[PDB]
Design an enzyme around this catalytic site. Structure first.
Site, PDB file in Angstrom:
ATOM      1  N   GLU A 150      38.175  28.867  30.375  1.00 11.86           N
ATOM      2  CA  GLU A 150      39.338  29.823  30.791  1.00 11.86           C
ATOM      3  C   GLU A 150      39.359  31.005  29.779  1.00 11.86           C
ATOM      4  O   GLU A 150      39.701  32.110  30.101  1.00 11.86           O
ATOM      5  CB  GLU A 150      40.479  29.205  31.210  1.00 11.86           C
ATOM      6  CG  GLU A 150      40.382  28.463  32.736  1.00 11.86           C
ATOM      7  CD  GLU A 150      40.037  29.415  33.725  1.00 11.86           C
ATOM      8  OE1 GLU A 150      39.620  28.697  34.903  1.00 11.86           O
ATOM      9  OE2 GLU A 150      40.098  30.735  33.845  1.00 11.86           O
TER      10      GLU A 150
ATOM     11  N   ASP B  58      40.374  38.608  36.367  1.00  9.60           N
ATOM     12  CA  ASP B  58      39.554  37.682  36.809  1.00  9.60           C
ATOM     13  C   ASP B  58      38.070  38.200  36.751  1.00  9.60           C
ATOM     14  O   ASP B  58      37.817  39.404  36.838  1.00  9.60           O
ATOM     15  CB  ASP B  58      39.718  37.208  38.221  1.00  9.60           C
ATOM     16  CG  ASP B  58      40.475  36.068  38.442  1.00  9.60           C
ATOM     17  OD1 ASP B  58      40.178  35.253  39.252  1.00  9.60           O
ATOM     18  OD2 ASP B  58      41.547  36.218  37.929  1.00  9.60           O
TER      19      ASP B  58
END
Length: 164
Positions: free
Chosen positions: A11, A20
């Site tokens: 991440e 994102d």
């Protein structure tokens, strides 16, 4: 290697609101804020999540706090889920981390939809399940990450994350 180190490779860490792979507003270690297109909606969710006026920016410290809550919620969600629990319980420690990773990325609901692969993982048909998991939007949209997760389920070792 552990769940936190693994997810932190996947991440990343960003201290400023960001988008994102999906275009969604996120912050920290993959903490999705909103699926809404306004930066303003995102800022407000942020301040709600941290309990202060952040102005779109947080500390490392706040990032890790959010990350601890998210991992805890992911595990608890697996444990509460009728489709997920039995697969989780059946798996060894390493492979358990691979399922947790999928749940963190895509939510309980999304993973519980991988019916056939779940079934194969329960039966310990590692090579079969790895082929079936690759046949998904998930793999096609984020192939390097899905590939790491998939090797982890296939082999049951942390090699995919050694490199990284």
């Amino acid at each position: 290697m552990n769940i936190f180190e693994m997810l932190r490779i996947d991440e990343g860490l960003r201290l400023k609101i960001y988008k994102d792979t999906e275009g969604y507003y996120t912050i920290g270690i993959g903490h999705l804020l909103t699926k809404s297109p306004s930066l303003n909606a995102a800022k407000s969710e942020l301040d709600k999540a941290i309990g202060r006026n952040c102005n779109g920016v947080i500390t490392k410290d706040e990032a890790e706090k959010l990350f601890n809550q998210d991992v805890d919620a992911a595990v608890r969600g697996i444990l509460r889920n009728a489709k997920l629990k039995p697969v989780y319980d059946s798996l060894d420690a390493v492979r358990r981390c691979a399922l947790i990773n999928m749940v963190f990325q895509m939510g309980e609901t999304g993973v519980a939809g991988f019916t056939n692969s779940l079934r194969m993982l329960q039966q310990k048909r590692w090579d079969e399940a790895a082929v079936n998991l690759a046949k998904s939007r998930w793999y096609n949209q984020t192939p390097n990450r899905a590939k790491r997760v998939i090797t982890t389920f296939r082999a049951g070792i942390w090699d995919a994350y050694k490199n990284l």
